[PDB]
Structures are given as structure tokens and as C-alpha cells.
Symmetry: C4
Subunit: 91 residues, 4 copies
């Protein structure tokens, strides 16, 4: 479950990285950063896509990627972080 | 369920698009972009409504639209994305 | 339930409105706008508190207000919007 | 439960505060503010990390810290705020 969600999240972020560096001209690391803060809904305080293609893609990217990203974060905190913490509280 | 949530989400976004392009003077695509990042809570890093009417509308728009938009995203990821993925993992 | 959550949400927003207009010098409508986009986690793309008092208050305001605001949004969409829609789909 | 989530949240915020003030050169209060609005997904409207190290750290920080922070907010609103309110509504 976690493995699949991890892979799916990675693929989604690679797509965003490729899109923004190509269409919006961002450096790859910046394209990845924007993709991550967008899908996790944190948002970026400085960059907004400047092209209409970028705006349309971002709208679709958000609707299709938010569920997955939070599905991964949700399982990562309950199936990987909770135990490593829960079992730790055991005297 | 998904169909109705889809339609409701679309209608909500059309209202925002019309409002912001009219009252805030945004190009339609920009009004749609702002409506989407606002209701999905990603937020925009460059635009904030400049008129008091725009600020009041945005406040009400957020409270009334967030639930719906996330209801659609939630069902889209579980009733349309989960299966298309779950059934795929079947050897 | 909805009534109490509504009142609590209103009181929380009034406190933020008073704080930001007083300490950060925002016009009341702007203080309310900032309080709303902050607690709903949409965030504002232009304003960040400029005083240390404002930054500390905002940190505490977020932790104490996010739960409530989303408790209100959650119930508003399920106990007031769902029915008005669910009952409507009835031929 | 609440105590542990509180401590874990505090430790996570201290790490962010140290990272951003050191690598991004922010004043400690600003580093804490950025860490908080980032992990609660509110986001900051003015600051984005400027170094590649800062961008990479922020990406990892978000994925590892969002679950916890919202686990704390969730329990704080249900196991500490709900009762103090629920018991109050009792005539
Ligand atoms: Rb958010
Ligand atoms: Rb934001
Ligand atoms: Rb700016
Ligand atoms: Rb945000
Ligand atoms: Rb900005
Ligand atoms: Rb922002």
C-alpha cells in the first residue's frame, strides 16, 4: 500500500517537474518545489504560472493529484510514523 | 454521486470565474485559476482581491465552496482513482 | 451543533479582525480577510504579519482556530448543504 | 496522546526554526513562522526558500511534518477543545 502510494506520488511529481520546467521555464528543482507545495496545498508565495497552458495544467493537476498526495501522507503518518512512535512509547 | 459532485463543482467554479472577471477585472482564465486555487485551499501567491466587494465575496465563497470541492476530490480519488488503480494491482 | 459552531467561528474571526487591525494596522475588512484565509488554510498571497507580536499571535491563532473553522465547514457541508442537495435529487 | 503529539510538534518546529535561520538566514521568529504556516499548509505569501538546500529540505519537511501537525491539531480540537465546549453547553 505504502509502496504503491509512494511510487504513484513520485510519478505525479515527476510529471509536474517536467511540465513546469518545460512550459513555464522553471529550473527543475523549482518545478519540483512548485509541484510539491501545490499538491500538498501549502502553495507558493512567489510563483504563479504565467502561461495559459500552465494555468490550465495546474488546475487539472490539483484536482487529480491532491487526493493521491494526501493518501500517501495519510498512510505515511499512520502506517509508518505512528508505529515507529507507538511502539517507542512502550517502556 | 460523482456526476452530481462534478456538476456542482463546475457550477461553483463558473460563478467564481464570472465574479472575479467582472468585479476584479481578471481575464476569465485567471478568474478560474484564482477560484480553483482558493477553493482547493492551495491559494495564489500573487493575487489578492483588491476591492471590498471582492474580499467579502471571497470570504463567503470559501466557506460555501470548500466543503463541496473537497467532497468531489475525495470521491474522485476513492470512487474513480482507487478502483482504476486497485483493480490494476491484480496480477 | 451548527449554531454553536457558527457562533464560535464568528467570535474567532472577530478576535482576528480586532487583532490585525490594531497591531498590524490593517483596515478592518482586510484584517477579517486575512483571518479567514489564514484559518481556512487558503493563505494570503500578499500579506504576512510585519511585527513579531503579529507573527506570534498568528502562530497561536492557527493552531487554536483551524480545528474549529473546519469543524464548522465540515458540518455546514454535511448537515446543511448535503440535505438541501440530497433531498433535491429526489424526483 | 495529546502530550506526546504536543512534544513531537514542538520538536519538529524547532528543527525547522534552526534550519531556516541557519541555511536561509531568517531571523529565528521568521524561521518559526515559516515552519508553522508551511506545515499547517496555510503557506507564506512572501517567502519561498532561496537556496536549493532550502527547497529540498522544505519538500521533505512538508511530507514528514504535515501528518503530525494535523494529528496534533485534530486531537487538540477534539480531546481538549470539544470537551471544554461540550461540557459548557450543559445548563
Ligand atoms: Rb491548505
Ligand atoms: Rb498559500
Ligand atoms: Rb510580491
Ligand atoms: Rb495554502
Ligand atoms: Rb506574494
Ligand atoms: Rb501564498
Amino acid at each position: 500500500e505504502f509502496q504503491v502510494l509512494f511510487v504513484l506520488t513520485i510519478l505525479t511529481l515527476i510529471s509536474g517537474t517536467i511540465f513546469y520546467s518545460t512550459v513555464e521555464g522553471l529550473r527543475p528543482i523549482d518545478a519540483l518545489y512548485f509541484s510539491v507545495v501545490t499538491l500538498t496545498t501549502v502553495g507558493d508565495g512567489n510563483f504563479s504560472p504565467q502561461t495559459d497552458f500552465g494555468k490550465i495544467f495546474t488546475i487539472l493537476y490539483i484536482f487529480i493529484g491532491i487526493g493521491l498526495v494526501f493518501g500517501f501522507i495519510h498512510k505515511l503518518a499512520v502506517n509508518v510514523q505512528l508505529p515507529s512512535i507507538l511502539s517507542n512509547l512502550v517502556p
